[PDB]
Amino acid sequence: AMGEELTLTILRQTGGLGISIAGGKGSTPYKGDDEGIFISRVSEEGPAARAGVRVGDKLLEVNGVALQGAEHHEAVEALRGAGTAVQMRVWRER
């Protein structure tokens, strides 16, 4: 297999999830031509790091909201509106 599909739960903490994202349909890609949404930063002090989110993870879904074909700002909105426990489905390439 080329990668692992993981489901991680991030408990929003002290005002954020502790991630940045890159990519999206019509934005600068994080990888090749892939227009998907990718984790571009994980704050060392933030809850995503502690939950096991990794830079370069491809974000597939956030609390039921699919991000396939999503634009960047749509994904930002999905993360912001995801509530206190944020369940992320990610694809982690080898």
The tokens of 17 are what? 């999830």
SS3 80: helix
The residue segments making up the domain with residue 59 are: 1-94
Domain count, the chain: 1
Closest CA to 76 of 91, 55, 59, 90: 59
Q: How was this entry determined?
A: X-ray
Q: What is the resolution of this structure in A?
A: 1.6
d(CA 21, CA 58): 9
Q: 7: burial class by Cβ within 10 Å (0-12, 13-18, 19+)? A: exposed
Q: Which residues contact 4 (CB under 8 A, 6 or more apart)?
A: 91, 92
